[PDB]
Amino acid sequence: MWENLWYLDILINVLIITIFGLISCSSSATKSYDLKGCFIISMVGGVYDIPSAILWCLASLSILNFNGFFASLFLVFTWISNLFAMQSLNFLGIYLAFEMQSLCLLVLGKITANENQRWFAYRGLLKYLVLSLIAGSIFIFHASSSYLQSGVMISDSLVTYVFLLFKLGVAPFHMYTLELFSVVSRHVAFVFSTLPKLSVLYLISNSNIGSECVWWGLISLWLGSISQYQSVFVRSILLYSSVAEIGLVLLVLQEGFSWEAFSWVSIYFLSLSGVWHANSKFVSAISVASIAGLPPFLGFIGKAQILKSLVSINLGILIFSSILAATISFIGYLRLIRLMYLVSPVKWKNNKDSSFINWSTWMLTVGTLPMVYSV
Amino acid sequence: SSANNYDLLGQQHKFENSKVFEEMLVEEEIAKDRELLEDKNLAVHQLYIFDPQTQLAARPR
Amino acid sequence: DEPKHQIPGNALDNWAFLRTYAKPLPDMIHYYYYVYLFGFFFVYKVADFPEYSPRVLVMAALIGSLFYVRRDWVHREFKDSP
Amino acid sequence: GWEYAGTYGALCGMVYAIGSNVISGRAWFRRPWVHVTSVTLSYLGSKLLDEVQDTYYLEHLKRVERKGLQVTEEHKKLFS
Amino acid sequence: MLLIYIMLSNIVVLALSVVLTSSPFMALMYSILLYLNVQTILWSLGYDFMALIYALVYVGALAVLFLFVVMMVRIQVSTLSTKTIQSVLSWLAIILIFSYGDVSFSFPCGAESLLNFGTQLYSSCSDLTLLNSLALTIALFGSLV
Amino acid sequence: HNDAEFLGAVYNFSIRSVFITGILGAVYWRRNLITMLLCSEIAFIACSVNFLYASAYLNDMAGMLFSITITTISACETALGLALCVGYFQSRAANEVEALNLLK
Amino acid sequence: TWPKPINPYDVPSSPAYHRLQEPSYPVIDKDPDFWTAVSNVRKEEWGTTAAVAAGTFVMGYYLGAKGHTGKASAYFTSFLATKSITLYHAYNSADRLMGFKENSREVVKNV
Amino acid sequence: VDSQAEWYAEYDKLEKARQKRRIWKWRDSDSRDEYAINAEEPVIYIR
Amino acid sequence: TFNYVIPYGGSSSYTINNEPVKAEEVTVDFSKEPSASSLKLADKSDWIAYTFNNVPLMATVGLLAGAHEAFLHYERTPIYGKRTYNIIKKLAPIVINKTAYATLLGAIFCATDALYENYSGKKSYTSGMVAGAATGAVFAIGRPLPQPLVWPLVFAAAPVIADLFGEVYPESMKSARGYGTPYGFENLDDAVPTRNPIRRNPHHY
Ligand SMILES: CCCCCCCCCCCCCCCCCC(=O)OC[C@H](COP(=O)([O-])OCC(O)COP(=O)([O-])OC[C@@H](COC(=O)CCCCCCCCCCCCCCCCC)OC(=O)CCCCCCCCCCCCCCCCC)OC(=O)CCCCCCCCCCCCCCCCC
Ligand SMILES: CCCCCCCCCCCCCCCCCC(=O)OC[C@H](COP(=O)([O-])OCC(O)COP(=O)([O-])OC[C@@H](COC(=O)CCCCCCCCCCCCCCCCC)OC(=O)CCCCCCCCCCCCCCCCC)OC(=O)CCCCCCCCCCCCCCCCC
Ligand SMILES: CCCCCCCCCCCCCCCCCC(=O)OC[C@H](COP(=O)([O-])OCC(O)COP(=O)([O-])OC[C@@H](COC(=O)CCCCCCCCCCCCCCCCC)OC(=O)CCCCCCCCCCCCCCCCC)OC(=O)CCCCCCCCCCCCCCCCC
Ligand SMILES: CCCCCCCCCCCCCCCCCC(=O)OC[C@H](COP(=O)([O-])OCC(O)COP(=O)([O-])OC[C@@H](COC(=O)CCCCCCCCCCCCCCCCC)OC(=O)CCCCCCCCCCCCCCCCC)OC(=O)CCCCCCCCCCCCCCCCC
Ligand SMILES: CCCCCCCCCCCCCCCCCC(=O)O[C@@H](COC(=O)CCCCCCCCCCCCCCC)COP(=O)(O)OCC[N+](C)(C)C
Ligand SMILES: CCCCCCCCCCCCCCCCCC(=O)O[C@@H](COC(=O)CCCCCCCCCCCCCCC)COP(=O)(O)OCC[N+](C)(C)C
Ligand SMILES: CCCCCCCCCCCCCCCCCC(=O)O[C@@H](COC(=O)CCCCCCCCCCCCCCC)COP(=O)(O)OCC[N+](C)(C)C
């Protein structure tokens, strides 16, 4: 019964915080900082390893910039779903966790839209829903065939590999991100383009979900780079950068380089924090430099990990493609710098809520030299 | 017309300047929680409808 | 006044060419739905494909890139006609 | 591990304070309390990161020795 | 045996009727009949509680939500009939292509016990039921706002 | 010669046809969103029935559990999606004509 | 074959999660209760509990005062964190009694 | 200023760093599923 | 060297050789050997057989490209309006012509490659360059002036890239290990492994 207590404490924590927030709901505290701190404390009871501590760190940094009890509660729900995705041992765990996370995404997207933004945000949420239904239905049908044929539910199969390709957002499965994250709140796009990936990477590494095929990561890299270079809108540029990088990280993870992808996801979270929560041009400039992989900042270390892992596996086509696609993506990042300082006078909203933005920029500048051992 | 327009202008400026400090600070908080309450998906908005001039609960929703 | 690039073509003819892009726009979910479905089934079938030489794979990629038509190209040139 | 971690951390705390002032439009000397706090926390954090790195270095050494990597006493000295 | 075959065969016609009809209200009726036929299929496999669950959750509750939405969003979809012969046979050919030559296994009969099912749901697989309850709570909180 | 083998093949054919009709039916026959979600429910029911069938075949409880999980998750997804559909239809502008039928 | 008889009232059941490990250390108690585990919590662990309680009281007051509810937030946060850390310590002490974790002090103190 | 000592100390530092890196590059899979490759690792599963 | 007086780098004696020493005591391989199907498809002995084995890739790619274009057309046609013309009569030529022309280009490429290798008798870069040149020439039969030059060059360059990074690159760096002692330098005192690291199992997807 003692082993069950570890999981049960997290429930009891979440429930009592929920009922306390429901009772203590007032206009005097619309920004419920106290429940945010309570949620952060409660999520410490789920840390058991380094990857779980990274999950906690990103979850807390995300919950800081959500406003209200309700959105923070659904971020806690996303954290629970992610924690169970890491611990899933067969098909049922994978399914339960990931469509719980999909439900949390739908709710978070719906509740952060204004009345004037409903026409496009609800359309994007609906399109995401239907595509996710396609993915889940195919997954569970093939899972039924596999469970019939083998008599057991084993998470080392092609079915879960393709389902996790959909979850990662690689090669033919990246369009839901483009449609949904273009029309949703910037924080929602930021937290759901970084945090979900860590659980999928952990599941792939631990449960041996790797394929010999390199087509999908190659397609992700080339398509992401070329579409980023051809995209006029800034949101599409940032969204396609993730497709390219996650294709490259998928190629690295299949070969067993778990440590490097676990560092890359964290450095990418920190790098994307500043450009998505754009309040200052200089912070966004450093963030864009970090995403490009540029040397003075921590983003150079994260990209260097992946590239260094590539030369070890000694696949020439991947390296050649990596160089050319990296140049193509660099052109789009340079477009982003040009738009801020070299096109026209720029005036932005004075949204002085840089909770972890200054800390993230400081970490990007500073952290390069301490982490140099990694590469 | 200039004379009359500046009469109305003077009435407005006199109204703004003549408020006491405690009222000014209270009005600053009114503006602030007006900005915080702009999001209509907040849990409290489901609870109540707030008076526009002073963001106090006027009637339940 | 400054030296400027010569723009080929007449102003109204170029504007008429550009106005052929103003056509009823389908929503992208219809393309995305089919691509997702056939892509899932395609990834399932790929694991059963025979191993091809790298040279043939690269030539197939080149042919596919050359044969790919941008969605805007069909948009401008589409005619609801036999 | 690194023998210059604490000095680096103090300098980087200065980096935090001055950068935060500059981004907000203030001068580098403004909000003096932020400087002391940033320096102290950054120094402590840099130290702690160094011990964490050393500890996982040693854990990896134990694992590889169990697996069969014939590390010598000098190689065992490389990992503090 | 003839009854089992008739139900297994009727499921495909009741699925085809849903997509073919142009009225959203009629498709819901066909789906309700499909759900009842799915209950009836589950009876041949030896499940009573599970087949009850399909009827209670889907026919009893989900269809009511669907029809509530359908009346609210009522739209004129009697625009035209596009069910040309050429389209319907193309759909049937696609269906035949997808559903052919797959691995088939002998029809089982397995008696279930809700005693064993309850014991496992609340002792050994208790992690599953609480996460399903959390998912229901997520749906409740999200839909009500 | 064996009724069970014949019934097994018929069941496989039928369940696969139901799945493919659910997933591709509403998009092939261009329909509104409400029909798309109903066909998605049909496909999920097909998969859950396959899992119950496998449970009967192997005398195992895993498929029973996965099927109740499918029922719960599908119902929650449909509720949220119907919420989004109703909200989408309430924000339609007068000029918009078939808002629900994006597949047109 | 024949159905095995089932006794409805005694049907074999087990908790959901299991620790797959044979006890390395001596087993003081095979199945400790909650109170047995709490009685075996070390003094240092209790001091850690008290320190967390005080720190979370101060932090809860600080955060709640920004929302004009300092006292209630402070008490709720204190109770929350104290409960969580006390359960963590009780789980560790129960593992020590079961022999999974080091138990030399425990075996000396309660023979 | 003993240039010989400085040169040899610097070279020794670099050579030690290389040895440490090559030890650090010796990595088997840490996957929880992979009990064969890690058979000797001391682990407990709570599942 | 880092000095202006004597040449940089070094030289190795050609007379002196160093006995090979194993990177580890016991070698465990997670890289699977080529399948018999791969060797069958790679076999260029019979040019007709080689062509017929490798064309399904080209036909597949042409079919996807034609399906993409045909769906772009189909998506646009209005369902609400009844159309006098037959849509499939419009759409089938697209897919069929794309697939046929792709298959023809791939057939020229594979046939010329196998024929050149048989006649030359050696596996070389030149076979791929000549097959690509012929394929690009067929691509630009009636095309305007830059294209007679550019397509033979691009189609010839593609097999060069495939050979350089698909065959030469892997074979050049087989020996390099990354663990234990550097492949050239075993005299140096580095930790020597009993077994090579297995970062992943042999794949099976
Ligand atoms: C202070 C001492 C710390 C030193 C050692 C730490 C261990 C002791 C933990 C003590 C706690 C200190 C926390 C520090 C680390 C946290 C780890 C941890 O906690 O668990 C690990 C620890 C044992 O796991 P392990 O040591 O990792 O070994 C297991 C295996 O080796 C499997 O694990 P593995 O993954 O490590 O396997 C080895 C791995 C080797 O992996 C490594 O080498 C690790 C490298 C170090 C990375 C450090 C960064 C990680 C970021 C996380 C930040 C920590 C957040 C703290 C969260 C917990 C707070 C307590 O090899 C791999 O290939 C796997 C890949 C690993 C990931 C790749 C690393 C990249 C990280 C990302 C870096 C990217 C840069 C970002 C920017 C940085 C720029 C400077 O578990 C515990 O000891 C118990 C955890 C209990 C936590 C909380 C429970 C107490 C409170 C309960 C009640 C709570 C409610 C009341 C609240 C009260 C307050 C109000
Ligand atoms: C009924 C449903 C209809 C679909 C039917 C098929 C259904 C799918 C079934 C299975 C799907 C999985 C496999 C399909 C391919 C994966 C792509 C995908 O699914 O992403 C979702 C994609 C939609 O995603 P999206 O985000 O909405 O669209 C992003 C674009 O911005 C879209 O916006 P955009 O169209 O307006 O802009 C297009 C843009 C987008 O950019 C791309 O297309 C990137 C493609 C680059 C190559 C991709 C990686 C290739 C690696 C292949 C790996 C296998 C071989 C391994 C070895 C190869 C080594 C390289 O590219 C262009 O601007 C046009 C040029 C296209 C190629 C550019 C490279 C040219 C190089 C040639 C140089 C020669 C010129 C020399 C002379 C120059 C004079 C100065 O759906 C599709 O496009 C599927 C259509 C299937 C047709 C593909 C035909 C051949 C496929 C195999 C050949 C591989 C080459 C790729 C060709 C282009 C493919 C896009
Ligand atoms: C590097 C490689 C990388 C590897 C890993 C890296 C590691 C990663 C993690 C590392 C992270 C580092 C980067 C992040 C840094 C953290 C951010 C940060 O800097 O603070 C942000 C935060 C931003 O402040 P803000 O911009 O004004 O915005 C907040 C608003 O006011 C909002 O207003 P509010 O309503 O929220 O007000 C709440 C708050 C915010 O309120 C304020 O901040 C207003 C200012 C606080 C009062 C002024 C502080 C008085 C002492 C300051 C000493 C400055 C000396 C300079 C001039 C010399 C004067 C002789 O009030 C507090 O200060 C709470 C703390 C309570 C302490 C108050 C002072 C107690 C009396 C003094 C105690 C001891 C006195 C001994 C000597 C005193 C004379 C030297 O700064 C603080 O909150 C300051 C908290 C602490 C105050 C300083 C106390 C230091 C103790 C005196 C020095 C004694 C020596 C120190 C050692 C011994 C310690 C006892
Ligand atoms: C303990 C006792 C104390 C003793 C002191 C010891 C303390 C140690 C150091 C502490 C000193 C404080 C550090 C300065 C903090 C603020 C710096 C700043 O804001 O920059 C401009 C600032 C002056 O700008 P501003 O006129 O006041 O207006 C700025 C407005 O906010 C925005 O104006 P805007 O909107 O018009 O933007 C126009 C922008 C045009 O737009 C752009 O060009 C953007 C381009 C993206 C970044 C540039 C990429 C290339 C940067 C290369 C790095 C330069 C060093 C190269 C050496 C190679 C290193 C590998 O042009 C510029 O901003 C200046 C261009 C050149 C500056 C670029 C270098 C800045 C790097 C990042 C700064 C650190 C921020 C940390 C954040 C802290 C938390 C928020 O500082 C300078 O006067 C020159 C920059 C000084 C560079 C030192 C910073 C260290 C970075 C090196 C990285 C090495 C790792 C870090 C280790 C550091 C030692 C531990
Ligand atoms: C070895 C370290 C390197 C590895 C890095 C990863 C490890 C991270 C370690 C350091 C983490 C530091 C994180 C810094 C976050 C910055 C603090 C912050 O965000 O404060 C917010 C907090 O905002 C909130 O929402 C408050 C609610 C939560 C309050 C904090 C909760 C504390 C919970 C207890 C956590 C204790 C840990 C539990 C036990 C481990 C306040 O900012 P705002 O008021 O929202 O806007 C700022 C406006 N402007 C700057 C422009 C003036
Ligand atoms: C994020 C995770 C999501 C999924 C979580 C799955 C993990 C949780 C699974 C467990 C759910 C809660 C079930 C209770 C957990 C602890 C077990 C327990 O306390 O019950 C005792 C039952 O025994 C007791 O300890 C009685 C005292 C119980 C007091 C209450 C403790 C449990 C409270 C549960 C919380 C529910 C309260 C309402 C929720 C707010 C164990 O049974 P036995 O000891 O074998 O039977 C007793 C016979 N004998 C002692 C002689 C061996
Ligand atoms: C120096 C040790 C003793 C310190 C005395 C405090 C001990 C009291 C028990 C703990 C209570 C909480 C500790 C205070 C921390 C934050 C409280 C706070 O937020 O301060 C103000 C407002 O917030 C601030 O001003 C920021 C203060 C930040 C902390 C500055 C004090 C630093 C020392 C206090 C904590 C030291 C440790 C406490 C004991 C461990 C609260 O505003 P009100 O809710 O209106 O209550 C005031 C009551 N009345 C107006 C009616 C008179």
Ligand SMILES: CCCCCCCCCCCCCCCCCCCC(=O)O[C@H](COC(=O)CCCCCCCCCCCCCC)COP(=O)(O)OCCN
């Ligand atoms: C990125 C490299 C791509 C090449 C770019 C060249 C310019 C593109 C123009 C397109 C022309 C088609 C490509 C031809 C390049 C090959 C060079 C020709 C040399 C040559 O014919 O010798 C062959 C070997 O060289 C070879 O085929 C292998 C040589 C590798 C090419 C050179 C690599 C470095 C070039 C980088 C320049 C700067 C990069 C910017 C593009 C024959 O050899 P054999 O074995 O068949 O003997 C014959 C027994 N029958």
